[PDB]
Design a protein around this nucleic acid. Structure first.
Ligand SMILES: Nc1nc2c(ncn2[C@@H]2O[C@H](COP(=O)(O)OP(=O)(O)NP(=O)(O)O)[C@@H](O)[C@H]2O)c(=O)[nH]1
Lengths: 126, 430, 23, 176, 136, 37, 133, 192
RNA sequence: ACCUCGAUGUCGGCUCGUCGCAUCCUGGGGCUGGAGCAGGUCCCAAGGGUUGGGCUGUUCGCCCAUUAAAGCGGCACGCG
RNA sequence: GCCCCUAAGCGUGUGCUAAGUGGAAAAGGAUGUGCAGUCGCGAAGACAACCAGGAGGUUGGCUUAGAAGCAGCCACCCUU
């Protein structure tokens, strides 16, 4: 609960948000901190997971085309950035989610605009 | 009002029996007490007589000589090596024209000076006024202060009704009122502490009491063995409140070192009644450590003093004499033959330098072995699942040989009877 | 004691103005 | 005010009647009644809820708002699910035996002790060393549970007695 | 224990009380100080007790000043006598304190421990006091 | 239980309240519970 | 329920194991031999083990990497920690060694950052009082 | 360094005396007097609230600008008569000071830092005198006590003054003394 | 030194009381360094009870044998 | 002084008190309550509430039969 750190957190989020070719936002309510270790070990080839505070994520969401996910900023934020494209990381993100059941994918962003969960999961399974 | 003030001292003493060595030692310790009280010793006179002087404790010519001595030296107090009647006090006062104090009054004022808190103030006040009543006429003629006055007694024409005369107000009337109330509290605190002393006795925890001479390192032994610091030693030329703390033996078995006020030759019985508060500790004590200064050339005097006081106390409750461990402290101060002159008469005493602990190991061994443990020698083997029982053996038990085997932990130890009954099943001699 | 205390306190009143005879 | 403002939902299998100042609530378990403080108003929302409001924001009104709200909440919860408070007994030789509408404890006393279940409450027994008390009113359930608790004075030294399942009572020691 | 080493007159009128302190009303020797809000006669015994309280609370350092000194003599007649025959002898020594006058000064790094010591002292004292410090 | 005109929360757990017009203290340790009177 | 440390070289140590976990009802006889057969290649290096027991005392042993204190101190050669941590120098260690110990410990750590684990081990060392750089 | 003169209002006091002044203090106006080389002084009523606010913000030697009857007047408060029981500001002395006028002012001396573990600090003089132009008066000065060893004496002449500032006071005056910490026995000896 | 000196008759014991609770016993609780027994402390409680002898003029005080207990004070140190 | 005793007002307006305070009292204790003024955090989600996160480095080292996070002592660093 800090105020001056709002801008720092927003900048740190935005830099990696733009660096990642595509991003997907989920809620990770249920997994012990350890399971994130296996998740990152599995996704290390193409993607990286990170937690964030929705209170500042909503404010930072107006910078780019993630505004379409305004309704989707609920629950414990978990960003799974993908280095390049979305399938390369989604193919493993979806399988890890279906295995552990501690993650629910709610939003995504690619090409400067938001894509739906149906789009993300179709790219994953394709 | 009614206090005491050895301004400057001019000791007077009478040698009645014993030896010149005894007389000089008595007068010198009296001078030491006076110096502690604060008076400065100017000179010390001694008169040798077959028996005391029941007139004024000295000859009349000697009294005139002392008057001249006091006028010449500009002294203010004369301290006499004895306890004297009010008549003798008044005679000496009219012969010398100065305040005359004695050994008993000096010691009582020393106690008043030292006592800080607790029941000590009440004890000191009661002892002082009980000693002042027999000398109420002697001190009452050596009033001092008083703001003078005239009689101070004139009611009025009586008629058909005598004066109230229900005077429940008097010199000691309060002292009497007070002590009558405060004896109950004196006993009540004893009893409430005894409520836990009994539980201490329940365990092996034995009571060890220090019996020592005044200003005889009585607190050095505590600070050496127990280690705990004692405020102002709680033991010196004159302490009142005894202390105690939980230490450990040579073997490790716990116990309580009880530091107690020291003794002086013929300590006034008015103060032996206050000493009772620490001298029931001698009967409570499983062991007695009889400490004596090592630099002394006549230890037997103080040894006999402590022995007679403890005999007087024990005779009351006919308790079997506890073990006595003779200890000589501050040993380095004397020569080899100086130690021998005591050793030859009393060879079992252990000479320990409390300032550094020389021989303290042997002292601890001796006292621990003298305080026989109230345990049971038991050999047992307990499976590994009884690690809690092994832990309890470590905590309360006395391990002698602990080893391990597939069956369990072979422990030979000294343990309390309850635990011995508890784990009797696995005993080798089951 | 009560007698004296009340005797004095009668002094603080609306018709006496803080002064009464005999204290 | 805070808590007192939150409206009270009324589950489907419930019945409410806000008659004058009094409130009556019925359901599968049974009927219950309550009254309200004059400076607090009560009403029926159009969406199956009970609304409680105040005409002011004073000390008494603020204190009473949450009170009345939770009173209604407990009323509606009782008329549907009621309450059941567990118990348990520790100590070798201690026992409890059901006598229908009444209950017996053997607690090491000279004479076994009888407690009679009052109207609107039932005693269920799962074993000689544990049981439960059920009813439709939280106040009565708790009162009877406490009365059962009072039977044997606390025994810190050994802990034997009747206590709730979750209670972790103090435990000192005696020398021997 | 404080006692004037000499006094020109040993039997003086009673120090008058009315008025507010016109001097010694500002802490000057240390960080915190104790100010008085009503009149009193602080005696050497109470001053010594309060000083011991502060020193025994701090236990390892700091510095304490006593901006007041008991020097006025006060005399009581001998016990159980009548009115007459001159004034009594001087028995206890007091300082005529007035509202505002600062009594004790303390300098210690730890503000809360200093405040605690000052509270102990004001309890031992017979007067309503308050802790103050240098700042306005 | 103690009944003194001065009541102190002598430990972190102690809680002061005013009950029926009389201040008092409660604690997880009954040694500390006390009333003002 | 219980987690201790044991060296694969030997088994059934009296103080460390005797009254430590055998008190809780563990089949030490079989557990020690199973652990030795599982990790005898490590020789006498101490290794942490955590035991998980079921209702019927059926046991499973989980292994972790050798202690960070040992890994930090053996390099210098000292086989014990600092009696007064941070007050007495006991050894000198390099930042590369600290990071390598951190990477080895990441399995023991609940961490997912290798540099952060390096920070972990740097603290673990300097708190004992070991020079790190 | 420089400071903006703080704007205050001030109405000429109609009548004077103890009664008038205490009624003004009662209803919230602190009485004050503005004097200086500018001919016969005048008597003003200042709002106690904002006056105390500016005083606490900018020290006891802040620079004021009185809107007396609208007429702007730069001034410098010289001293404050403050009650010793309730710390109520009963009077203020204001000195008409023209731009760049050199004035003698009293400035506090703060202490910052800590000495060796077995040591104690003892400040001795809050106020030191200074000469400086009206608008360059520091609110406070500072004296370093970091890493000082054993007995140390800091005098008015051993401090670092600002530029445009001269030390009126005697340079040898002792303002801080750092001395070995007292023991418990030394504490008891004190006052014996 | 305010009423009473053209009079208010005094200590202890006896008979007869009556009131206060700052409770000795009996009753109800809290805490206890409250295993049990037996204690200690504090809170509430004034309904009833509260021995007979030796020494002492004695108030008071010490002692003997009991007792659940052998409470403390006011009422012209209650009452000639 | 003005409700009835008891002549005159259960007078008018604005607030405070729950103690019959009013209609006696001290040090000192305290979270009763009205007002005024401050300073910290606060929809960027303040405090509370429910916790899926709060696990592990690792006996942090010495003491340790033993202190594995909370018999003790030293630092007391650290992500996710
Ligand atoms: N002879 C001797 N005495 C020692 C030794 N160690 C301690 N003491 C005694 O310890 C005392 C310490 O002072 P303390 O007991 O507190 O009281 P005090 O010194 O007697 N006070 P006062 O001077 O008034 O008599 C010394 O006086 C000395 O009597 C020692 O080695 N030898």
């Amino acid at each position: 609960m800090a105020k001056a750190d709002k801008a720092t957190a927003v900048a740190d989020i935005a830099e990696q948000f733009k660096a990642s070719t595509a991003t997907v936002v989920t809620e990770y309510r249920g997994l012990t901190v350890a399971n994130l270790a296996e998740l990152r070990r599995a996704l290390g080839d193409s993607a990286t997971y990170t937690v964030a505070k929705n209170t500042l994520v909503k404010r930072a969401a107006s910078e780019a085309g993630i505004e379409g996910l305004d309704e989707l900023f609920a629950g414990p934020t978990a960003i799974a950035f993908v280095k390049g494209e979305a399938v390369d990381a989604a193919k493993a993100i979806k399988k890890f989610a279906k295995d552990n059941k501690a993650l629910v994918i709610k939003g995504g962003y690619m090409d400067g605009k938001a894509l739906s969960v149906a789009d993300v999961e179709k790219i994953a399974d394709l | 009002y009614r206090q005491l003030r050895l301004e400057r001292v001019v000791l007077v003493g009478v040698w009645t029996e014993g030896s010149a060595a005894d007389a000089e030692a008595s007068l010198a310790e009296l001078a030491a007490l006076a110096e502690t009280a604060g008076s400065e010793v100017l000179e010390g006179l001694i008169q040798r007589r077959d028996k005391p002087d029941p007139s004024t404790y000295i000859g009349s010519g000697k009294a005139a000589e002392l008057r001249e001595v006091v006028l010449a030296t500009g002294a203010d107090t004369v301290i006499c090596d004895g306890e004297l009647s009010p008549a003798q006090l008044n005679a000496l006062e009219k012969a010398v024209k100065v305040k005359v104090i004695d050994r008993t009054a000096l010691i009582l004022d020393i106690f008043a000076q030292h006592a800080t808190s607790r029941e000590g103030k009440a004890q000191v006040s009661l002892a002082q006024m009980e000693y002042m009543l027999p000398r109420l006429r002697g001190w009452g003629e050596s009033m001092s202060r008083q703001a003078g006055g005239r009689a101070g007694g004139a009611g009025g024409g009586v008629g058909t009704r005598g004066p109230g005369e229900t005077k429940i107000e008097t010199d000691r009337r309060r002292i009497r009122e007070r002590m009558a109330k405060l004896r109950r509290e004196i006993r009540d605190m004893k009893k409430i502490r005894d409520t836990q002393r009994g539980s201490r006795r329940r365990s092996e925890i034995p009571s060890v009491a220090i019996v020592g001479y005044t200003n005889a390192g009585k607190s050095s032994l505590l600070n050496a063995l127990t280690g705990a610091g004692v405020l102002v030693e709680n033991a010196l030329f004159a302490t009142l409140e005894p202390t105690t703390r939980r230490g450990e033996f040579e073997d490790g078995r716990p116990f309580v070192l009880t530091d107690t006020v020291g003794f002086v030759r013929h300590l006034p019985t008015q103060l032996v009644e206050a000493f009772r508060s620490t001298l029931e500790e001698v009967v409570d004590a499983d062991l007695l450590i009889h400490v004596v200064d090592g630099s002394d050339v006549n230890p037997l005097a103080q040894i006999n003093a402590v022995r007679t006081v403890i005999n007087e106390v024990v005779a009351e409750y006919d308790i079997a004499p506890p073990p006595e461990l003779l200890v000589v402290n501050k040993i380095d101060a004397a020569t080899g033959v100086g130690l021998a002159q005591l050793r030859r008469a009393l060879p079992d005493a252990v000479f320990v330098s409390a300032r550094t602990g020389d021989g303290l190991d042997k002292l601890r061994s001796r006292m621990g072995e003298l305080v026989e443990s109230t345990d049971a020698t038991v050999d047992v083997t307990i499976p590994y699942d009884r690690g809690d029982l092994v832990a309890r053996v470590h905590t309360d038990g006395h391990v002698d040989a602990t080893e391990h085997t597939d069956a369990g932990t072979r422990i030979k130890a000294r343990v309390p009877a309850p635990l011995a009954a508890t784990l009797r099943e696995y005993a080798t001699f089951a | 004691a009560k007698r004296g205390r009340k005797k004095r306190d009668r002094k603080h009143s609306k018709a006496n103005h803080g002064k009464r005879p005999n204290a | 005010s805070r808590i007192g403002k939150q409206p009270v939902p009324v589950p489907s299998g419930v019945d409410v009647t806000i008659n004058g100042q009094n409130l009556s609530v019925k359901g599968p378990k049974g009927t219950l009644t309550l009254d309200v403080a004059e400076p607090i108003s009560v009403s029926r929302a159009e969406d199956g809820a009970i609304v409680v409001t105040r005409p002011d924001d004073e000390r008494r009104s603020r204190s009473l708002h949450g009170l009345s709200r939770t009173l209604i909440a407990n009323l509606v919860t009782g008329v549907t699910e009621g309450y059941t408070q567990k118990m348990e007994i520790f100590g070798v030789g201690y026992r409890v035996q059901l006598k229908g509408q009444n209950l017996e404890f053997a607690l090491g006393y000279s004479h076994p002790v009888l407690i009679e279940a009052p109207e609107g409450i039932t005693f269920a027994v799962e074993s000689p060393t544990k049981f439960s008390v059920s009813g439709i009113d939280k106040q009565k359930v708790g009162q009877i549970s406490a009365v059962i608790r009072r039977l044997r004075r606390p025994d810190p030294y050994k802990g034997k007695g009747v206590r709730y399942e979750g209670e972790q009572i103090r435990r000192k020691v005696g020398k021997t | 224990m404080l006692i004037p080493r000499k006094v020109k007159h040993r039997k003086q009128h009673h120090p008058e009380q009315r008025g507010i302190a016109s001097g010694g009303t500002s802490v000057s020797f240390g960080d915190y100080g104790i100010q008085a809000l009503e009149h009193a006669y602080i005696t050497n015994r109470q001053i010594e007790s309060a000083r011991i309280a502060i020193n025994r609370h701090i236990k390892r350092g700091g510095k304490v000043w006593i901006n007041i000194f008991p020097d006025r003599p006060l005399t009581k007649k001998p016990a159980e006598t009548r009115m007459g025959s001159g004034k009594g002898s001087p028995e206890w020594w007091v300082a005529n304190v007035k509202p505002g006058r600062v009594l004790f000064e303390l300098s210690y790094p730890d503000e809360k421990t200093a405040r605690d010591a000052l509270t102990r002292a004001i309890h031992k004292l017979p007067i309503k006091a308050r802790i103050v410090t240098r700042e306005e | 239980m103690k009944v003194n005109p001065s009541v102190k929360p002598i430990c972190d757990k102690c809680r002061v309240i005013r009950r029926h017009g009389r201040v008092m203290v409660i604690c997880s340790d009954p040694r500390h519970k006390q009333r003002q009177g | 329920l219980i987690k201790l440390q044991i060296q694969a070289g030997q088994a059934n140590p009296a103080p460390p194991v005797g009254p430590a976990l055998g008190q809780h009802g563990v089949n030490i006889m079989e557990f020690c031999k199973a652990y030795n057969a599982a990790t005898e290649s490590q020789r006498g290096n101490v290794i942490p083990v955590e035991i998980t027991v079921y209702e019927d005392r059926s046991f499973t042993f989980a292994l972790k990497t050798p202690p960070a204190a040992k890994l930090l101190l053996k390099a210098a050669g000292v086989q014990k920690g600092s009696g007064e941590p941070h007050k007495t120098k006991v050894a000198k260690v390099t930042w590369d060694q600290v990071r390598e110990i951190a990477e080895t410990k990441k399995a023991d750590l609940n961490a997912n950052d290798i540099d952060a684990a390096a920070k972990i081990i740097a603290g673990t060392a300097r708190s004992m009082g070991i020079t790190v750089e | 360094t420089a400071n903006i003169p703080n704007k205050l209002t001030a109405n000429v006091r109609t009548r004077t005396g103890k009664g008038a002044s205490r009624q003004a203090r009662r209803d919230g106006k602190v009485p004050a007097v503005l004097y200086g080389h500018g001919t016969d002084p005048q008597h003003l009523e200042l709002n106690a609230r904002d006056f105390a606010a500016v005083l606490r913000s900018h020290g006891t030697n802040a620079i004021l600008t009185l809107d007396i009857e609208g007429t702007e007047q730069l001034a410098l408060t010289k001293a404050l008569d403050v009650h010793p029981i309730r710390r109520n500001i009963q009077h203020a002395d204001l000195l008409v000071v023209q731009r760049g006028e050199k004035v003698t002012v009293e400035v506090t001396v703060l202490v910052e830092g800590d000495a060796t573990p077995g040591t104690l600090v003892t400040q001795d003089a809050n106020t030191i005198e200074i000469e400086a132009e009206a608008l360059s008066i520091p609110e406070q000065l500072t004296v370093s006590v970091e890493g000082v060893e054993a007995g140390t004496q800091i005098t008015a002449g051993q401090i670092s003054l600002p530029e445009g500032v001269n030390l009126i006071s005697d340079p040898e005056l002792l303002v801080v003394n750092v001395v070995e910490a007292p023991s418990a026995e030394a504490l008891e000896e004190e006052g014996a």
